[PDB]
Amino acid sequence: SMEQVAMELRLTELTRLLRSVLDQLQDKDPARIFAQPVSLKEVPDYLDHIKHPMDFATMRKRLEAQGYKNLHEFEEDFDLIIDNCMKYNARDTVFYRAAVRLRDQGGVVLRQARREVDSIG
Numbered sequence: 001s002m003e004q005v006a007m008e009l010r011l012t013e014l015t016r017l018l019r020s021v022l023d024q025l026q027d028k029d030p031a032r033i034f035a036q037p038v039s040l041k042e043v044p045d046y047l048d049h050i051k052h053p054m055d056f057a058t059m060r061k062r063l064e065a066q067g068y069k070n071l072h073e074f075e076e077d078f079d080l081i082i083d084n085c086m087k088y089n090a091r092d093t094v095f096y097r098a099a100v101r102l103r104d105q106g107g108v109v110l111r112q113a114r115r116e117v118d119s120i121g
């Protein structure tokens with residue numbers, strides 16, 4: 001139908017916008033601490049601690065499958081990356097501090113995205 005095409009056009013444009021957000025967010029992680037899933041060969045008991053792992057690569061996979069229906073779903077996954085890290089790692093680690101910095105700096109990008117999503121429909 002024409003409506004389904006229109007809808008898919010909107011989703012495609014959302015995906016274009018979220019891909020830009022994702023690249024902007026990943027820039028704020030230059031050490032690339034959050035680029036890939038935490039390795040179970042490197043952290044065998046990770047899943048005993050963290051029940052919903054997340055990372056930038058996994059987000060990108062869902063993104064390209066147009067699996068984010070709105071900005072809120074995308075933000076949920078971003079928050080998972082940060083919150084998982086701030087629980088698994090102690091306050092005085094380079095990991096915890098990297099999450100804090102990624103959180104604080106990412107806030108600007110996400111503030112704009114919320115307004116762009118709202119204004120452009």
Ligand SMILES: CC(=O)N1CCN(c2ccncc2)CC1
Pocket residue numbers: 033034038042043084085088089095
């Ligand atoms: C994202 C996150 O929490 N981490 C990623 C890096 N990491 C390891 C990497 C290599 N070996 C052991 C651990 C644990 C902490």
